[PDB]
Design a protein around this ligand. Structure first.
Ligand SMILES: Cc1ncc(COP(=O)(O)O)c(C=O)c1O
Ligand SMILES: Cc1ncc(COP(=O)(O)O)c(C=O)c1O
Lengths: 322, 322
């Protein structure tokens, strides 16, 4: 309320000052690490033959900086190592070293509110016809201005979603959704359907009449004081994990379990959650209002708890910009 | 077969001559087209912010050159265009132009036995939060020495497969498999499974007890004089099409339909088919001989028919290397 005004006014203020440095500082529009080299993001180039491109044989993770403060970086670094493990990849540098390069990269950019991406690929030699010991994994890392999956102004009113019906989410026994990946075939078909049906956001089923996740976000339904989020079929979001921390402190029950589609049509409130946007209310579903079409009271306490946590020492730390 | 001798000895002869040119000709190991430029393949670099990298937002296709003759290039071009249409991409150049460039690229490398790849991506601006008319699709093309999914000498004995049980193929209502794509998370999982179980080649199910395809190839079963190949849930291969043309010429019935997993344990012969290898016999399945472990008579007739077609003007044209 006054909390949204404080978050978005501070952002816009910080953005004006970062825009001013675009003249003097060539990393102010983003910075990339490639084969040990720092370059502007618009000029970064990867080998054609990298298997991240050739066969999307990669995982990634995406921490964030708000107001000069890394949010939950170590959760994102732990998830990345665990993602690596499951695809028989290994992070090419020590994690302590990766964390320091990240802090360096944020600081030379001068970006106070940032999207940060780490990519670990199979490398220049592919799986099909190579002995596993000859395989050298490659790292890429980049910082860019914070990205909004829902713009701050649509967050005040709420977006429109559809439950997708031309597409369903890739099932875990084909590709494990707990391994962050860029195989977005289903998600792109869903974004197109959403647009075709006069909406923005797709909600994908598992094909078995339950909900999973959308094109870059988790889903959370609210119903008689209780939050419900799918357990299975979905990426275990660090924004979803924050939702859960905030709820446990406000004494609100969170249920991570199978969530049937039908529950989305008789819930009190709906919101989406991601690092690239935060807490993102849905007020219209399949062309119809969500329980009056207003942004719900619990959605709003979750919203405020989440941004408060960006200033809490347990979840964040201050970067030194020189 | 003197036919296998013919083909693999002609290959080896032309290879020895291509390898000689490697110190005079910097395109002899591969050539790539990037933003209008021709460059050695090992030096080809693509923008990191390409959505082909960022979210595998792409289709591709892979025609062949054998003994200086393009093999069914017009079929692969018509399929690339069908593929682009279904993803709402557009081939960034006319197809007549793309054809001349490819021919120039093969003639400059001096490669007679070539793997040729075309990749159409979404471009530098992602689908999410960009107006459709501002999206500018990118092309990458490259030529390299012929790739063998199964080596010549293993084609003389046959290879080992497993019906996969840790992974199943991405279903068509998540990603359309008629759309050639590089989202190989399921296929890579399969290559690991197969290897962990002392085999080379994975056969993926649909999760509904039918066969689909494997990590870079279609599957074809022979049973009492009849070929059986899956219709649904697979790429519609140009090799498979050739197999089919050769079967009808020889009076052999081909059934393109649902093929149950059971049929693979009670058939007379098995073979895989792809542009990168040709006709590839399987003689051990789940660690047991297939119908006695010998390469079978219809596999052999199909093998020869397929390489005959490379010198037939209905299916191929001679390049001028100049
Ligand atoms: C498919 C998908 N699901 C869920 C999420 C939520 O992830 P997190 O809360 O860790 O940012 C993302 C992140 O962008 C995503 O891409
Ligand atoms: C998954 C998959 N199926 C089938 C094929 C066979 O395609 P084609 O016969 O046109 O090469 C390929 C080609 O590499 C493939 O990747």
């Amino acid at each position: 309320m006054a909390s949204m005004d404080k978050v978005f006014a501070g952002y816009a203020a910080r953005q004006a000052i970062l825009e001013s440095t675009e003249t003097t500082n060539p990393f102010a529009k983003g910075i990339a690490w490639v084969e040990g080299e720092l370059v502007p993001l618009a000029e970064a180039r990867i080998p054609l033959l990298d298997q991240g491109f050739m066969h999307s044989d990669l995982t990634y993770d995406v921490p964030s900086v708000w107001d000069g403060r890394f949010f939950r970086l170590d959760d994102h670094l732990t998830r990345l190592e665990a993602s690596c493990t499951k695809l028989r990849l290994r992070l090419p540098l020590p994690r302590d070293e990766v964390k320091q390069i990240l802090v360096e990269m944020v600081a030379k950019s001068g970006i106070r509110d940032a999207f940060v991406e780490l990519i670990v690929t199979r490398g220049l030699k592919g799986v099909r016809g190579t002995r596993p010991e000859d395989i050298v994994n490659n790292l890429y890392m980049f910082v860019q201005p914070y990205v909004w999956v829902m713009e701050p102004d649509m967050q005040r009113v709420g977006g429109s979603a559809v439950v997708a019906r031309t597409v369903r989410r890739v099932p875990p026994g084909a590709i494990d959704p707990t391994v962050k990946n860029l195989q977005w075939g289903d998600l792109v078909r869903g974004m197109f359907e959403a647009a075709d049906r006069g909406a923005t956001y797709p909600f994908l089923t598992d094909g078995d009449a339950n909900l999973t996740e959308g094109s870059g976000f988790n889903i959370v339904l609210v119903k008689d004081g209780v939050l419900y989020t799918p357990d299975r079929g979905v990426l275990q979001g660090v924004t979803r994990k924050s939702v859960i921390n905030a709820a446990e402190a406000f004494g609100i029950e969170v249920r991570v379990e199978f969530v049937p589609v039908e529950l989305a049509y008789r819930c009190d409130e709906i919101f989406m959650c991601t690092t690239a946007g935060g807490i993102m209310p849905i007020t219209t579903l399949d062309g119809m209002p969500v329980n009056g079409g207003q942004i719900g009271p619990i959605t709003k306490k979750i919203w405020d708890g989440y941004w408060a946590m960006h200033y809490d020492a347990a979840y964040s730390f201050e970067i030194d910009y020189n």
